[model samples]
Target: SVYDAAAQLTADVKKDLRDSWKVIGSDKKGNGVALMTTLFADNQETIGYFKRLGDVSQGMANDKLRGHSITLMYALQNFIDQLDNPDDLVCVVEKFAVNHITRKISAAEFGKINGPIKKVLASKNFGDKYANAWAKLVAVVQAAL
Candidate 1:
Protein backbone atom coordinates (compact mmCIF):
# COMPACT_ATOMS: atom_id res chain seq x y z
CA SER A 1 0.00 0.00 0.00
CA VAL A 2 2.87 2.37 0.74
CA TYR A 3 4.30 1.56 -2.64
CA ASP A 4 0.92 2.32 -4.19
CA ALA A 5 1.17 5.76 -2.64
CA ALA A 6 4.29 6.46 -4.66
CA ALA A 7 2.00 6.66 -7.67
CA GLN A 8 0.28 9.62 -5.99
CA LEU A 9 2.93 11.74 -7.65
CA THR A 10 1.08 13.08 -10.69
CA ALA A 11 2.67 13.52 -14.11
CA ASP A 12 2.74 17.26 -13.49
CA VAL A 13 4.58 16.73 -10.22
CA LYS A 14 7.11 14.53 -11.97
CA LYS A 15 7.62 17.22 -14.59
CA ASP A 16 8.22 19.78 -11.85
CA LEU A 17 10.67 17.44 -10.18
CA ARG A 18 12.59 16.87 -13.39
CA ASP A 19 12.70 20.54 -14.27
CA SER A 20 13.57 21.82 -10.80
CA TRP A 21 16.17 19.13 -10.29
CA LYS A 22 17.98 20.04 -13.48
CA VAL A 23 18.96 23.40 -11.99
CA ILE A 24 20.33 21.97 -8.72
CA GLY A 25 21.46 18.56 -9.92
CA SER A 26 23.67 20.06 -12.61
CA ASP A 27 25.95 21.21 -9.80
CA LYS A 28 25.45 18.25 -7.47
CA LYS A 29 28.63 18.80 -5.54
CA GLY A 30 27.97 22.46 -4.85
CA ASN A 31 24.31 21.95 -4.03
CA GLY A 32 25.07 18.88 -1.98
CA VAL A 33 27.62 20.88 -0.04
CA ALA A 34 25.06 23.58 0.51
CA LEU A 35 22.34 21.11 1.45
CA MET A 36 24.50 19.32 4.01
CA THR A 37 25.86 22.55 5.34
CA THR A 38 22.41 24.02 5.79
CA LEU A 39 20.95 20.79 7.13
CA PHE A 40 23.59 20.34 9.82
CA ALA A 41 23.96 24.00 10.62
CA ASP A 42 20.31 24.30 11.48
CA ASN A 43 20.17 20.91 13.15
CA GLN A 44 23.47 20.82 14.95
CA GLU A 45 22.45 18.13 17.41
CA THR A 46 21.92 15.76 14.53
CA ILE A 47 25.57 16.05 13.61
CA GLY A 48 26.49 13.66 16.40
CA TYR A 49 24.15 11.12 14.86
CA PHE A 50 26.65 10.69 12.10
CA LYS A 51 28.95 8.51 14.19
CA ARG A 52 30.86 7.35 11.17
CA LEU A 53 31.99 10.87 10.49
CA GLY A 54 33.89 11.14 13.80
CA ASP A 55 34.26 14.92 14.13
CA VAL A 56 32.17 16.83 11.62
CA SER A 57 32.93 20.04 13.50
CA GLN A 58 35.00 20.90 10.47
CA GLY A 59 31.75 20.47 8.49
CA MET A 60 31.70 19.97 4.71
CA ALA A 61 35.39 20.56 4.39
CA ASN A 62 35.95 17.13 5.87
CA ASP A 63 36.35 14.74 2.96
CA LYS A 64 34.12 12.06 4.45
CA LEU A 65 31.38 14.54 5.24
CA ARG A 66 31.62 16.01 1.75
CA GLY A 67 31.41 12.55 0.25
CA HIS A 68 28.29 11.81 2.31
CA SER A 69 26.67 14.92 0.89
CA ILE A 70 27.51 13.86 -2.65
CA THR A 71 26.18 10.38 -1.91
CA LEU A 72 22.85 11.77 -0.65
CA MET A 73 22.40 13.92 -3.76
CA TYR A 74 23.19 10.96 -6.01
CA ALA A 75 20.65 8.89 -4.11
CA LEU A 76 18.07 11.64 -4.72
CA GLN A 77 19.02 11.66 -8.39
CA ASN A 78 18.22 7.93 -8.44
CA PHE A 79 14.74 8.63 -7.06
CA ILE A 80 13.93 11.23 -9.73
CA ASP A 81 15.38 9.08 -12.50
CA GLN A 82 13.10 6.21 -11.44
CA LEU A 83 9.97 8.35 -11.43
CA ASP A 84 8.51 6.48 -14.38
CA ASN A 85 8.95 3.21 -12.48
CA PRO A 86 7.14 3.47 -9.16
CA ASP A 87 8.07 -0.02 -8.04
CA ASP A 88 11.76 0.65 -8.57
CA LEU A 89 11.48 4.06 -6.97
CA VAL A 90 9.84 2.59 -3.88
CA CYS A 91 12.47 -0.11 -3.69
CA VAL A 92 15.32 2.34 -3.86
CA VAL A 93 13.80 4.76 -1.37
CA GLU A 94 12.97 1.97 1.05
CA LYS A 95 16.53 0.73 0.86
CA PHE A 96 17.79 4.23 1.49
CA ALA A 97 15.54 4.56 4.53
CA VAL A 98 16.60 1.21 5.88
CA ASN A 99 20.23 2.24 5.73
CA HIS A 100 19.44 5.27 7.85
CA ILE A 101 17.16 3.30 10.12
CA THR A 102 20.09 0.99 10.82
CA ARG A 103 21.89 3.98 12.20
CA LYS A 104 18.91 4.53 14.56
CA ILE A 105 17.70 7.58 12.70
CA SER A 106 14.03 8.43 13.08
CA ALA A 107 11.59 9.54 10.41
CA ALA A 108 11.11 12.79 12.31
CA GLU A 109 14.82 13.49 12.17
CA PHE A 110 14.69 12.85 8.46
CA GLY A 111 11.75 15.23 8.13
CA LYS A 112 13.77 18.00 9.72
CA ILE A 113 15.88 18.20 6.58
CA ASN A 114 12.80 19.18 4.57
CA GLY A 115 13.00 22.79 5.74
CA PRO A 116 16.61 23.07 4.60
CA ILE A 117 15.70 21.48 1.28
CA LYS A 118 12.83 23.89 0.79
CA LYS A 119 15.01 26.82 1.70
CA VAL A 120 17.52 25.72 -0.92
CA LEU A 121 14.74 25.28 -3.48
CA ALA A 122 13.32 28.67 -2.68
CA SER A 123 16.74 30.24 -2.98
CA LYS A 124 16.88 28.75 -6.46
CA ASN A 125 13.62 30.59 -7.31
CA PHE A 126 11.39 27.52 -7.03
CA GLY A 127 7.76 28.54 -6.61
CA ASP A 128 4.88 27.11 -4.61
CA LYS A 129 3.99 24.65 -7.40
CA TYR A 130 7.47 23.15 -7.36
CA ALA A 131 7.62 23.13 -3.56
CA ASN A 132 4.27 21.38 -3.38
CA ALA A 133 5.51 18.76 -5.80
CA TRP A 134 8.54 18.19 -3.63
CA ALA A 135 6.30 17.83 -0.59
CA LYS A 136 4.28 15.17 -2.37
CA LEU A 137 7.43 13.30 -3.35
CA VAL A 138 8.81 13.56 0.20
CA ALA A 139 5.52 12.25 1.59
CA VAL A 140 6.12 9.02 -0.28
CA VAL A 141 9.67 8.73 0.94
CA GLN A 142 8.72 9.59 4.51
CA ALA A 143 5.95 7.03 4.40
CA ALA A 144 8.48 4.40 3.43
CA LEU A 145 10.87 5.58 6.14
Candidate 2:
Protein backbone atom coordinates (compact mmCIF):
# COMPACT_ATOMS: atom_id res chain seq x y z
CA SER A 1 0.00 0.00 0.00
CA VAL A 2 0.97 3.65 -0.25
CA TYR A 3 0.73 3.50 3.59
CA ASP A 4 -0.97 0.41 4.90
CA ALA A 5 0.04 -3.20 4.58
CA ALA A 6 2.81 -5.49 3.58
CA ALA A 7 3.05 -7.08 0.09
CA GLN A 8 0.79 -4.47 -1.39
CA LEU A 9 3.01 -3.37 -4.24
CA THR A 10 0.82 -3.33 -7.30
CA ALA A 11 1.89 -4.16 -10.84
CA ASP A 12 2.54 -0.51 -11.48
CA VAL A 13 4.75 -0.39 -8.43
CA LYS A 14 6.68 -3.41 -9.61
CA LYS A 15 7.15 -1.83 -13.01
CA ASP A 16 8.40 1.31 -11.36
CA LEU A 17 10.87 -0.80 -9.44
CA ARG A 18 11.97 -2.67 -12.54
CA ASP A 19 12.33 0.50 -14.54
CA SER A 20 14.15 2.22 -11.71
CA TRP A 21 16.62 -0.61 -11.66
CA LYS A 22 17.17 -0.05 -15.34
CA VAL A 23 17.91 3.61 -14.79
CA ILE A 24 20.55 2.64 -12.27
CA GLY A 25 21.95 -0.09 -14.44
CA SER A 26 22.03 2.03 -17.58
CA ASP A 27 25.05 3.95 -16.45
CA LYS A 28 26.50 1.23 -14.33
CA LYS A 29 29.71 3.03 -13.52
CA GLY A 30 28.16 6.37 -12.70
CA ASN A 31 25.28 5.08 -10.57
CA GLY A 32 27.53 2.60 -8.89
CA VAL A 33 29.95 5.33 -7.91
CA ALA A 34 27.15 7.59 -6.77
CA LEU A 35 25.62 4.81 -4.68
CA MET A 36 28.78 3.80 -2.82
CA THR A 37 30.00 7.34 -2.47
CA THR A 38 26.78 8.45 -0.89
CA LEU A 39 26.58 5.41 1.32
CA PHE A 40 30.08 5.96 2.68
CA ALA A 41 29.74 9.70 2.88
CA ASP A 42 26.48 9.60 4.75
CA ASN A 43 27.37 6.68 6.98
CA GLN A 44 31.02 7.04 7.84
CA GLU A 45 30.65 5.44 11.22
CA THR A 46 30.36 2.10 9.54
CA ILE A 47 33.65 2.74 7.82
CA GLY A 48 35.43 1.11 10.73
CA TYR A 49 34.28 -2.26 9.47
CA PHE A 50 34.48 -1.02 5.89
CA LYS A 51 38.12 0.02 6.10
CA ARG A 52 38.87 -3.05 4.07
CA LEU A 53 36.90 -1.34 1.33
CA GLY A 54 40.14 0.61 0.95
CA ASP A 55 40.56 4.23 0.02
CA VAL A 56 37.50 5.05 -1.97
CA SER A 57 39.06 8.49 -2.04
CA GLN A 58 41.26 7.24 -4.84
CA GLY A 59 44.77 6.30 -3.87
CA MET A 60 44.82 3.49 -6.40
CA ALA A 61 42.19 1.54 -4.49
CA ASN A 62 39.31 2.38 -6.78
CA ASP A 63 39.53 -1.04 -8.42
CA LYS A 64 37.93 -2.61 -5.37
CA LEU A 65 35.34 0.12 -5.08
CA ARG A 66 34.35 -0.02 -8.73
CA GLY A 67 34.02 -3.79 -8.70
CA HIS A 68 31.98 -3.73 -5.51
CA SER A 69 29.72 -1.08 -6.90
CA ILE A 70 29.04 -3.10 -10.02
CA THR A 71 28.52 -6.26 -8.01
CA LEU A 72 26.07 -4.59 -5.65
CA MET A 73 24.16 -3.01 -8.50
CA TYR A 74 24.03 -6.35 -10.27
CA ALA A 75 22.80 -8.13 -7.18
CA LEU A 76 20.01 -5.64 -6.56
CA GLN A 77 19.02 -5.71 -10.21
CA ASN A 78 18.83 -9.49 -9.99
CA PHE A 79 16.66 -9.28 -6.90
CA ILE A 80 14.33 -6.77 -8.50
CA ASP A 81 13.97 -9.02 -11.53
CA GLN A 82 12.95 -11.84 -9.22
CA LEU A 83 10.49 -9.88 -7.09
CA ASP A 84 7.77 -12.25 -8.25
CA ASN A 85 9.56 -15.09 -6.54
CA PRO A 86 8.95 -14.50 -2.86
CA ASP A 87 11.38 -17.12 -1.61
CA ASP A 88 14.18 -15.89 -3.84
CA LEU A 89 13.60 -12.27 -2.92
CA VAL A 90 13.59 -13.00 0.79
CA CYS A 91 16.69 -15.10 0.54
CA VAL A 92 18.54 -12.26 -1.15
CA VAL A 93 17.42 -9.63 1.34
CA GLU A 94 18.29 -11.98 4.18
CA LYS A 95 21.85 -12.18 2.92
CA PHE A 96 22.00 -8.40 2.89
CA ALA A 97 20.76 -8.24 6.47
CA VAL A 98 23.18 -10.90 7.53
CA ASN A 99 26.05 -8.99 6.00
CA HIS A 100 25.26 -6.06 8.22
CA ILE A 101 24.57 -8.07 11.36
CA THR A 102 28.12 -7.72 12.65
CA ARG A 103 28.06 -4.03 11.88
CA LYS A 104 24.96 -3.64 14.05
CA ILE A 105 22.81 -2.10 11.36
CA SER A 106 19.35 -2.66 12.70
CA ALA A 107 16.46 -3.13 10.30
CA ALA A 108 15.00 -0.06 11.97
CA GLU A 109 17.75 2.02 10.44
CA PHE A 110 16.91 1.05 6.86
CA GLY A 111 14.19 3.62 6.51
CA LYS A 112 16.48 6.45 7.54
CA ILE A 113 19.47 4.97 5.79
CA ASN A 114 17.53 4.77 2.56
CA GLY A 115 17.27 8.53 2.48
CA PRO A 116 20.34 8.84 0.31
CA ILE A 117 19.32 6.16 -2.14
CA LYS A 118 15.80 7.51 -2.31
CA LYS A 119 17.25 10.93 -2.96
CA VAL A 120 19.29 9.60 -5.85
CA LEU A 121 16.25 7.94 -7.38
CA ALA A 122 14.25 11.13 -7.05
CA SER A 123 17.00 13.08 -8.72
CA LYS A 124 16.59 10.71 -11.62
CA ASN A 125 12.89 11.62 -11.81
CA PHE A 126 11.54 8.46 -10.23
CA GLY A 127 8.86 10.40 -8.34
CA ASP A 128 7.25 9.79 -4.93
CA LYS A 129 5.28 6.84 -6.20
CA TYR A 130 8.49 4.96 -6.74
CA ALA A 131 9.90 6.03 -3.42
CA ASN A 132 6.74 4.94 -1.63
CA ALA A 133 7.05 1.53 -3.23
CA TRP A 134 10.56 1.26 -1.84
CA ALA A 135 9.29 2.38 1.53
CA LYS A 136 6.89 -0.54 1.51
CA LEU A 137 9.53 -2.97 0.30
CA VAL A 138 11.96 -1.85 2.93
CA ALA A 139 9.32 -2.22 5.60
CA VAL A 140 8.81 -5.79 4.55
CA VAL A 141 12.53 -6.57 4.72
CA GLN A 142 12.85 -4.67 7.98
CA ALA A 143 10.15 -6.83 9.50
CA ALA A 144 12.05 -9.89 8.39
CA LEU A 145 15.10 -8.62 10.21
Candidate 3:
Protein backbone atom coordinates (compact mmCIF):
# COMPACT_ATOMS: atom_id res chain seq x y z
CA SER A 1 0.00 0.00 0.00
CA VAL A 2 2.82 2.38 0.82
CA TYR A 3 4.67 1.47 -2.34
CA ASP A 4 1.53 1.97 -4.38
CA ALA A 5 0.91 5.33 -2.80
CA ALA A 6 4.49 6.39 -3.45
CA ALA A 7 4.38 5.11 -7.01
CA GLN A 8 1.19 7.05 -7.70
CA LEU A 9 2.82 10.21 -6.47
CA THR A 10 5.78 9.64 -8.73
CA ALA A 11 3.58 9.03 -11.75
CA ASP A 12 1.76 12.30 -11.13
CA VAL A 13 4.92 14.35 -11.03
CA LYS A 14 6.06 12.86 -14.32
CA LYS A 15 2.66 13.67 -15.75
CA ASP A 16 2.91 17.27 -14.60
CA LEU A 17 6.33 17.59 -16.13
CA ARG A 18 5.00 16.20 -19.38
CA ASP A 19 2.02 18.54 -19.40
CA SER A 20 3.65 21.76 -18.34
CA TRP A 21 7.42 21.81 -18.69
CA LYS A 22 9.22 22.04 -21.96
CA VAL A 23 12.16 19.77 -21.52
CA ILE A 24 15.20 20.87 -23.48
CA GLY A 25 18.80 19.89 -23.91
CA SER A 26 21.32 21.48 -21.56
CA ASP A 27 23.53 21.92 -24.58
CA LYS A 28 23.18 21.26 -28.26
CA LYS A 29 24.57 17.81 -27.72
CA GLY A 30 22.99 17.23 -24.35
CA ASN A 31 19.88 15.25 -23.58
CA GLY A 32 16.43 16.78 -23.11
CA VAL A 33 16.17 18.47 -19.75
CA ALA A 34 13.11 19.55 -17.82
CA LEU A 35 12.65 23.23 -18.58
CA MET A 36 10.91 24.24 -15.37
CA THR A 37 14.25 24.54 -13.67
CA THR A 38 13.11 27.48 -11.54
CA LEU A 39 10.38 25.54 -9.80
CA PHE A 40 12.62 22.54 -9.37
CA ALA A 41 15.57 24.63 -8.30
CA ASP A 42 13.49 26.20 -5.59
CA ASN A 43 12.94 22.73 -4.16
CA GLN A 44 16.53 21.95 -3.33
CA GLU A 45 15.62 19.61 -0.50
CA THR A 46 13.77 17.30 -2.85
CA ILE A 47 16.63 17.36 -5.33
CA GLY A 48 19.08 16.54 -2.60
CA TYR A 49 17.10 13.46 -1.64
CA PHE A 50 17.35 12.07 -5.17
CA LYS A 51 21.04 12.70 -5.20
CA ARG A 52 21.42 10.94 -1.90
CA LEU A 53 19.24 8.05 -3.00
CA GLY A 54 21.47 7.62 -6.04
CA ASP A 55 24.53 7.66 -3.82
CA VAL A 56 23.14 5.17 -1.31
CA SER A 57 21.67 2.79 -3.85
CA GLN A 58 24.86 2.54 -5.81
CA GLY A 59 26.38 -0.96 -5.62
CA MET A 60 23.80 -2.05 -3.05
CA ALA A 61 22.18 -5.44 -3.44
CA ASN A 62 18.49 -6.33 -3.13
CA ASP A 63 18.85 -7.07 0.58
CA LYS A 64 19.72 -3.45 1.28
CA LEU A 65 16.31 -2.10 0.30
CA ARG A 66 15.45 -1.45 3.92
CA GLY A 67 18.40 0.86 4.29
CA HIS A 68 17.38 2.74 1.19
CA SER A 69 13.86 3.10 2.57
CA ILE A 70 15.21 4.46 5.82
CA THR A 71 17.28 6.95 3.87
CA LEU A 72 14.22 7.96 1.87
CA MET A 73 12.11 8.54 4.98
CA TYR A 74 14.77 10.81 6.39
CA ALA A 75 14.92 12.63 3.12
CA LEU A 76 11.14 12.99 3.00
CA GLN A 77 11.09 14.52 6.44
CA ASN A 78 13.70 17.01 5.37
CA PHE A 79 11.70 17.90 2.30
CA ILE A 80 8.52 18.29 4.31
CA ASP A 81 10.29 20.64 6.66
CA GLN A 82 11.51 22.77 3.78
CA LEU A 83 8.15 23.33 2.15
CA ASP A 84 6.72 26.85 2.34
CA ASN A 85 3.71 26.33 0.12
CA PRO A 86 1.36 23.62 -1.08
CA ASP A 87 2.96 23.41 -4.52
CA ASP A 88 6.37 22.99 -3.01
CA LEU A 89 5.16 20.00 -1.06
CA VAL A 90 3.78 18.49 -4.23
CA CYS A 91 7.04 19.10 -6.03
CA VAL A 92 9.11 17.32 -3.43
CA VAL A 93 6.78 14.34 -3.16
CA GLU A 94 6.67 13.88 -6.92
CA LYS A 95 10.39 14.28 -7.28
CA PHE A 96 10.95 11.68 -4.58
CA ALA A 97 8.70 9.18 -6.32
CA VAL A 98 10.41 9.72 -9.65
CA ASN A 99 13.73 8.98 -8.07
CA HIS A 100 12.47 6.03 -6.05
CA ILE A 101 10.89 4.05 -8.86
CA THR A 102 13.18 5.11 -11.67
CA ARG A 103 16.26 4.27 -9.65
CA LYS A 104 14.93 0.82 -8.89
CA ILE A 105 15.01 1.37 -5.17
CA SER A 106 13.39 -1.72 -3.70
CA ALA A 107 10.21 -2.16 -1.66
CA ALA A 108 12.42 -3.73 0.99
CA GLU A 109 14.19 -0.39 1.26
CA PHE A 110 10.80 1.25 1.54
CA GLY A 111 9.99 -1.16 4.34
CA LYS A 112 13.19 -0.16 6.05
CA ILE A 113 12.30 3.51 5.70
CA ASN A 114 8.80 2.80 6.96
CA GLY A 115 10.16 1.24 10.14
CA PRO A 116 11.65 4.52 11.26
CA ILE A 117 9.00 6.73 9.72
CA LYS A 118 6.28 4.72 11.40
CA LYS A 119 7.99 5.27 14.71
CA VAL A 120 8.21 8.99 14.14
CA LEU A 121 4.70 9.02 12.80
CA ALA A 122 3.52 7.40 16.01
CA SER A 123 5.69 9.47 18.31
CA LYS A 124 4.35 12.58 16.61
CA ASN A 125 0.85 11.15 16.99
CA PHE A 126 0.52 10.49 13.29
CA GLY A 127 -0.38 6.81 13.40
CA ASP A 128 -1.69 4.89 10.35
CA LYS A 129 -4.07 7.69 9.50
CA TYR A 130 -1.17 10.06 9.13
CA ALA A 131 0.77 7.65 6.98
CA ASN A 132 -2.25 7.10 4.80
CA ALA A 133 -2.88 10.82 4.63
CA TRP A 134 0.72 11.44 3.62
CA ALA A 135 0.45 8.72 1.04
CA LYS A 136 -2.67 10.33 -0.39
CA LEU A 137 -0.97 13.67 -0.50
CA VAL A 138 1.91 12.06 -2.32
CA ALA A 139 -0.49 10.52 -4.77
CA VAL A 140 -2.19 13.86 -5.36
CA VAL A 141 1.11 15.59 -5.96
CA GLN A 142 2.21 12.79 -8.27
CA ALA A 143 -0.97 13.12 -10.28
CA ALA A 144 -0.57 16.86 -10.63
CA LEU A 145 3.04 16.62 -11.53
Candidate 4:
Protein backbone atom coordinates (compact mmCIF):
# COMPACT_ATOMS: atom_id res chain seq x y z
CA SER A 1 0.00 0.00 0.00
CA VAL A 2 1.12 3.58 -0.71
CA TYR A 3 0.34 4.50 2.88
CA ASP A 4 2.68 1.84 4.23
CA ALA A 5 5.48 3.05 1.97
CA ALA A 6 4.80 6.69 2.71
CA ALA A 7 4.79 6.02 6.47
CA GLN A 8 8.18 4.33 6.33
CA LEU A 9 9.60 7.09 4.11
CA THR A 10 8.32 9.86 6.37
CA ALA A 11 10.02 8.23 9.32
CA ASP A 12 13.17 7.67 7.29
CA VAL A 13 13.41 11.34 6.29
CA LYS A 14 12.80 12.56 9.86
CA LYS A 15 15.59 10.32 11.14
CA ASP A 16 17.91 11.48 8.36
CA LEU A 17 17.28 15.21 8.90
CA ARG A 18 18.28 14.77 12.55
CA ASP A 19 21.46 13.04 11.39
CA SER A 20 22.39 15.78 8.91
CA TRP A 21 21.04 19.22 8.10
CA LYS A 22 22.95 19.17 4.80
CA VAL A 23 20.18 17.08 3.37
CA ILE A 24 18.08 20.20 3.19
CA GLY A 25 19.02 23.67 4.38
CA SER A 26 22.24 25.52 5.25
CA ASP A 27 25.12 24.09 3.21
CA LYS A 28 27.60 25.48 5.76
CA LYS A 29 26.58 22.69 8.13
CA GLY A 30 28.27 20.06 5.94
CA ASN A 31 28.77 18.89 2.36
CA GLY A 32 25.29 18.25 1.05
CA VAL A 33 26.80 18.04 -2.44
CA ALA A 34 28.28 14.64 -1.67
CA LEU A 35 25.13 12.74 -2.53
CA MET A 36 24.47 14.50 -5.82
CA THR A 37 28.14 14.53 -6.71
CA THR A 38 28.44 10.88 -5.91
CA LEU A 39 25.33 10.24 -7.89
CA PHE A 40 26.83 11.78 -11.00
CA ALA A 41 30.20 10.26 -10.28
CA ASP A 42 28.66 6.84 -10.06
CA ASN A 43 26.74 7.36 -13.26
CA GLN A 44 28.71 9.72 -15.38
CA GLU A 45 26.87 8.69 -18.49
CA THR A 46 23.57 9.51 -16.90
CA ILE A 47 24.53 13.15 -16.78
CA GLY A 48 23.71 13.40 -20.46
CA TYR A 49 20.23 12.06 -19.86
CA PHE A 50 18.71 15.37 -18.87
CA LYS A 51 18.21 18.47 -20.96
CA ARG A 52 18.18 20.59 -17.81
CA LEU A 53 21.61 19.43 -16.72
CA GLY A 54 22.81 17.00 -19.35
CA ASP A 55 25.92 18.95 -20.27
CA VAL A 56 27.78 17.15 -17.46
CA SER A 57 29.39 20.45 -16.60
CA GLN A 58 26.01 22.11 -16.18
CA GLY A 59 24.54 20.04 -13.35
CA MET A 60 27.87 19.08 -11.79
CA ALA A 61 28.63 22.52 -10.41
CA ASN A 62 28.91 22.79 -6.62
CA ASP A 63 25.96 25.16 -6.53
CA LYS A 64 23.95 23.39 -9.21
CA LEU A 65 24.49 19.97 -7.67
CA ARG A 66 23.31 21.20 -4.33
CA GLY A 67 20.28 22.62 -6.03
CA HIS A 68 19.51 19.29 -7.68
CA SER A 69 20.07 17.34 -4.47
CA ILE A 70 18.12 19.59 -2.13
CA THR A 71 15.23 20.02 -4.52
CA LEU A 72 14.46 16.31 -4.42
CA MET A 73 14.70 16.32 -0.65
CA TYR A 74 12.34 19.25 -0.52
CA ALA A 75 9.90 17.49 -2.84
CA LEU A 76 10.04 14.44 -0.60
CA GLN A 77 9.50 16.74 2.34
CA ASN A 78 6.26 17.74 0.68
CA PHE A 79 5.26 14.09 0.81
CA ILE A 80 6.48 13.86 4.37
CA ASP A 81 4.40 16.84 5.38
CA GLN A 82 1.39 15.05 4.00
CA LEU A 83 2.03 11.58 5.40
CA ASP A 84 -1.34 11.49 7.10
CA ASN A 85 -2.93 12.15 3.73
CA PRO A 86 -1.91 9.21 1.60
CA ASP A 87 -4.18 10.30 -1.22
CA ASP A 88 -2.22 13.50 -1.47
CA LEU A 89 1.00 11.52 -1.78
CA VAL A 90 -0.57 9.58 -4.63
CA CYS A 91 -1.45 12.83 -6.35
CA VAL A 92 2.03 14.21 -5.83
CA VAL A 93 3.85 11.24 -7.31
CA GLU A 94 1.29 10.94 -10.07
CA LYS A 95 1.95 14.52 -10.99
CA PHE A 96 5.66 13.81 -11.11
CA ALA A 97 5.05 10.73 -13.21
CA VAL A 98 3.02 12.74 -15.65
CA ASN A 99 5.69 15.38 -15.79
CA HIS A 100 8.32 12.78 -16.55
CA ILE A 101 6.23 11.20 -19.27
CA THR A 102 5.57 14.54 -20.86
CA ARG A 103 9.28 15.09 -21.02
CA LYS A 104 9.86 11.71 -22.68
CA ILE A 105 11.78 10.29 -19.77
CA SER A 106 12.20 6.54 -19.54
CA ALA A 107 11.41 4.41 -16.53
CA ALA A 108 14.89 2.87 -16.57
CA GLU A 109 16.48 6.30 -16.34
CA PHE A 110 14.39 7.03 -13.25
CA GLY A 111 15.57 3.77 -11.69
CA LYS A 112 19.18 4.81 -12.24
CA ILE A 113 18.73 7.64 -9.74
CA ASN A 114 18.15 5.19 -6.91
CA GLY A 115 21.52 3.48 -7.27
CA PRO A 116 23.59 6.61 -6.62
CA ILE A 117 21.16 7.81 -3.95
CA LYS A 118 21.52 4.54 -2.03
CA LYS A 119 25.29 4.65 -2.39
CA VAL A 120 25.45 8.09 -0.82
CA LEU A 121 23.33 6.89 2.11
CA ALA A 122 26.15 4.50 3.03
CA SER A 123 28.16 7.36 4.56
CA LYS A 124 25.09 9.25 5.85
CA ASN A 125 24.67 6.35 8.36
CA PHE A 126 20.96 6.56 7.66
CA GLY A 127 20.67 2.85 8.46
CA ASP A 128 19.82 0.13 5.98
CA LYS A 129 16.28 -0.43 7.22
CA TYR A 130 14.62 2.66 5.77
CA ALA A 131 17.19 3.14 3.08
CA ASN A 132 16.13 -0.20 1.74
CA ALA A 133 12.52 0.66 2.45
CA TRP A 134 12.71 3.92 0.51
CA ALA A 135 14.56 2.23 -2.33
CA LYS A 136 11.79 -0.35 -2.43
CA LEU A 137 9.29 2.45 -2.60
CA VAL A 138 11.22 3.97 -5.48
CA ALA A 139 11.08 0.68 -7.33
CA VAL A 140 7.32 0.65 -7.09
CA VAL A 141 6.94 4.26 -8.19
CA GLN A 142 9.26 4.21 -11.19
CA ALA A 143 8.09 0.81 -12.33
CA ALA A 144 4.59 2.21 -12.78
CA LEU A 145 5.81 3.74 -16.03
User: Which candidate number has the best lDDT?
Assistant: 1
Computed on alpha carbons, the lDDT of every model, listed in order, comes to 0.84, 0.70, 0.40, 0.58
Superposed by TM-score, candidate 4 places the C-alpha of residue 105 at a distance from the truth, in angstroms, of 2.5
Count of clashing residue pairs in every prediction: 0, 0, 13, 0
Cα displacement (Å) at residue 76, model 1: 0.6
Worst 10 residues of 2 by lDDT: 1-10
Q: List model 1 lDDT by residue over 37-106, tens digit each.
A: 8877899888788778766667667888888888889998999999999989988989888897788777
RMSD of each: 1.5, 3.6, 15.5, 4.2
Residue pairs clashing, model 2: none
Better of 1 and 3 by lDDT: 1
lDDT value for model 3: 0.40
lDDT at position 35, candidate 3: 13
Better candidate by lDDT, 2 or 3: 2
Model 3 lDDT per residue over 47-77, tens place: 4444543433222332243354445445445
Worst 10 residues of 1 by lDDT: 51-60
Alpha-carbon shift of residue 75 in model 4 (angstroms): 1.1
Residue 128 of model 3 has an lDDT of 71
What lDDT is obtained when candidate 4 is compared to the true structure?
0.58
> In candidate 2, what are the lDDT values of residues 1-145, reduced to their tens digit?
2123234657887888888877767877778778777766887765565577788776225888788777877766766876777666767767776776666767776556476678779779888877777776777567655
lDDT of 4 by residue, 1-145 (tens): 5445554556555555444434433452133455556667887776665546434454435455556666766665565455556678767877777877886777787777666656656565645664665566565457445
